[PDB]
Amino acid sequence: IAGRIVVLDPGHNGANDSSINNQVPDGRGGTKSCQTSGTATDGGYPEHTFTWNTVLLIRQQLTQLGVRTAMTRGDDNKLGPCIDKRAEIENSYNPDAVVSIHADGGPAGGHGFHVNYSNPPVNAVQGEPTLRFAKTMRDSLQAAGLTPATYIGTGGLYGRSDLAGLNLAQHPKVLVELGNMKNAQDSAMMTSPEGRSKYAQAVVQGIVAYLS
Ligand SMILES: [Zn+2]
């Protein structure tokens, strides 16, 4: 585990302007908006702040394990990089694994996590190396006591073709939606410092399980 390289992507920007509406190539024949604002709990806790703070905790734990780390943004209050640029930044580190951290907006009674991965793969690394990462991450999150999403995906897994950040990956990568910000139980855990710590520990267990 020590000496491996992991890049962490806290989804969305600390702040936005109309540049986020400019269209960028999506890695699968189309274009998508440079960025989207992301969601928030009904208490006003923004997705971008949740992902930022959870990624900081993931990074700290990985560094303590001797894992070399990088992030795709440096703050939670200014414009951050577009989704295609984030994939470029990730790829530039030749990482052994990449984890993007998001939280979702779904029906209020729906809760739990889902691990998004590229399907169908557009290159070889997005095949077995990435599917194994996705299944391993799902297994580790559920073993940590997290609930697979009750409202989307299949048993905590979601293969999809619409996400530029997944389509553009040259290294094993997953995008973990940790929960539904619009749900009472997930919002409480996302808004809790110790909830964010538990999310981060579980993601780290998935990274460790995959790299081993
Ligand atoms: Zn998001």
Author numbering: 14 to 225
Task: Please give the exact wording used by the authors of the publication that reports this structure.
PG remodeling is performed by numerous autolysins acting on specific substrates and at different stages during bacterial growth. While glycosidases, such as muraminidases and glucosaminidases act to hydrolyze the glycosidic bonds between the carbohydrate units, peptidases, such as N-acetylmuramyl-l-alanine amidases, l,d-endopeptidases, d,l-endopeptidases, l,d-carboxypeptidases, and dd-carboxypeptidases, hydrolyze the amide bonds of the peptide stem at specific positions. Ami1Mab and Ami1Msm displayed an overall globular structure comprising a central β-sheet (β1, 4, 5, 6, 7, 8) surrounded by strands β2 and β3 forming an antiparallel β-sheet, six α-helices, and one 310 helix (η1). The catalytic zinc is coordinated by the highly-conserved triad which constitutes the amidase_3 motif signature, namely H25, E60, and H115 in Ami1Mab and H51, E86, and H141 in Ami1Msm.
The crystal structure of Ami1Mab was solved at a high resolution in its free form and also bound to l-Ala-d-IsoGln, one of the end-product of the reaction. Ami1Mab was purified without its first 40 amino acids in N-terminus, predicted to correspond to the signal peptide required for secretion. MDP was rapidly hydrolyzed by Ami1Mab, indicating that it is an active PG hydrolase that cleaves the amide bond between the N-acetylmuramic acid and l-Ala. Incubating Ami1Mab with the chelating agent EDTA prior to the reaction almost completely abolished the enzymatic activity. These results demonstrate that, like Ami1Mtb, Zn2+ is required for catalysis of Ami1Mab. To facilitate the search for the potential inhibitor’s binding-site, the Ami1Mab crystal structure was probed with the CASTp server to identify cavities in the protein structure. This analysis led to the identification of a single cavity of a volume of 72 Å2 comprising the active site of Ami1Mab. The three inhibitors could be docked into the Ami1Mab active site with similar binding energy (ΔG°). The proposed docking poses strongly suggest that the three inhibitors are able to occupy the active site in a manner similar to the dipeptide seen in the crystal structure. The docking study supports the view that these inhibitors might act by competing with the binding of the PG peptide stem.
